[PDB]
């Protein structure tokens, strides 16, 4: 049962930096994992950032992203930068276990980030 877990609520930094830990529970043990962070704004979903990483290696956002991340085993600690008040909202942690089979999709219940300054 691919289940994803993330905090209920997080305050952004004064400099618009919010971090949250999201780690998953895997029936197997997978080596190639893809993490995506989504914003759920009522009706729509938007892709905040993604990254693929190998089990044991460095989490690396070769995007260019506003996301940096560190990976401890079954865990990711994500940090999002450049947030502004209009960015307050619910952020879904999406994890794909991709290798070895079988494929697993886990979608978290969401993290509410409040950006005020």
């Amino acid at each position, epitope marked *: *049962a*691919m289940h994803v877990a993330q905090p209920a609520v997080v305050l952004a930094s004064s400099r618009g930096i919010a971090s949250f830990v999201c780690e998953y529970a895997s029936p197997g043990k997978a080596t190639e994992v893809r993490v995506t962070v989504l914003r759920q704004a009522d*009706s729509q*979903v938007t892709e905040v950032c993604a990254a693929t990483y190998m089990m044991g290696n460095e989490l690396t956002f070769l995007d260019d992203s506003i996301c940096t991340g560190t990976s401890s085993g079954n865990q990711v600690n994500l940090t999002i930068q450049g947030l502004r008040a209009m960015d307050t909202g619910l952020y879904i942690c999406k994890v794909e276990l*991709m290798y070895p*089979p079988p*494929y*697993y999709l886990g*979608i978290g219940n969401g993290t509410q980030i409040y950006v005020i300054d």
Partner: antibody
Amino acid sequence: QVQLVESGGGVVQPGRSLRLSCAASGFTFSHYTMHWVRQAPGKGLEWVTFISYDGHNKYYADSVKGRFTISRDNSKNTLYLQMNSLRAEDTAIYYCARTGWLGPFDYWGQGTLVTVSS
Amino acid sequence: EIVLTQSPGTLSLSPGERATLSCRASQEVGESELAWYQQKPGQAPRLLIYGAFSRATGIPDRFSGSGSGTDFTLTISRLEPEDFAVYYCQQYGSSPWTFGQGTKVEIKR
């Protein structure tokens, strides 16, 4: 407007190959995973194959493992299904479908008919 | 492979009635990573419900999803003529993606 338009359907003799193509318009193809799903005449849906974003992760149904190949040209915004060693039971409407960012198959092509028969 | 068993095979109801469709899973399903598709003859399937209970865009309110674990139910609160069609449930959280065999909702006369 999201749109998937499939082509390549036709008749094939058993043991041979056929390649379906699915042409995607209306969204940034490279941010979504894609599937093929078939429906034999008179029956329900059967998931055929899955391909990740960059194309470097592919999964197949047991009924076609070792015979079919899925692939994508992100530059041409096109999805392909390479079918080999075709059997009669592979005869179906073959749908191309897009994975929603939250998991389900939210947009579907129109389906193309593939008849495998001597 | 998570096998989805839909029931009944056919629903014989008259327009305006409430239709209740069921989908049971061979094992526990994801976290309600279950979806419902509609299909009329000669058309592709179209997503109705995802995440067990959330409506796809443009899907009217009469369609509603409930359930959890291994027991899921799609409800149509009042059947309009366009709702008579085939309905598939689908587990999409783990490979292989699997579908139920479908319930057909036909006009009782």
